[PDB]
Amino acid sequence: SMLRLQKRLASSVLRCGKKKVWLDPNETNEIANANSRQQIRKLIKDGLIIRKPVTVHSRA
């Protein structure tokens, strides 16, 4: 429905950009009713949202 608030707060908690914020497409309603940094940290501990890894840029 609307997850830009949770994506911005997840970027602010994870201390990175929202390009690396992965939200769970299956558990949309469990993320949408968080609405707070304390609940988004619980989403981090549950593992519903995951820090995306850095896009590779090889030196080889």
Smallest distance from the beta carbon of 33 to RNA, in angstroms?
23
The reply on whether position 20 binds RNA by CB under 7 A is: yes
* Residues sharing a CB contact under 8 Å with residue 21, sequence separation 6 or more, in sequence order: 7, 10, 11, 14, 49, 51, 52
Kindly determine how many residues on this chain lie close enough to bind RNA according to the rule CB under 7 A: 11
Instruction: Please state, in angstroms and rounded to a whole number, the distance separating the CA atoms of residues 49 and 7.
Output: 9
Smallest distance from the beta carbon of 20 to RNA, in angstroms?
4
Binding site for RNA (CB under 7 A): 11, 16-20, 54-57, 59
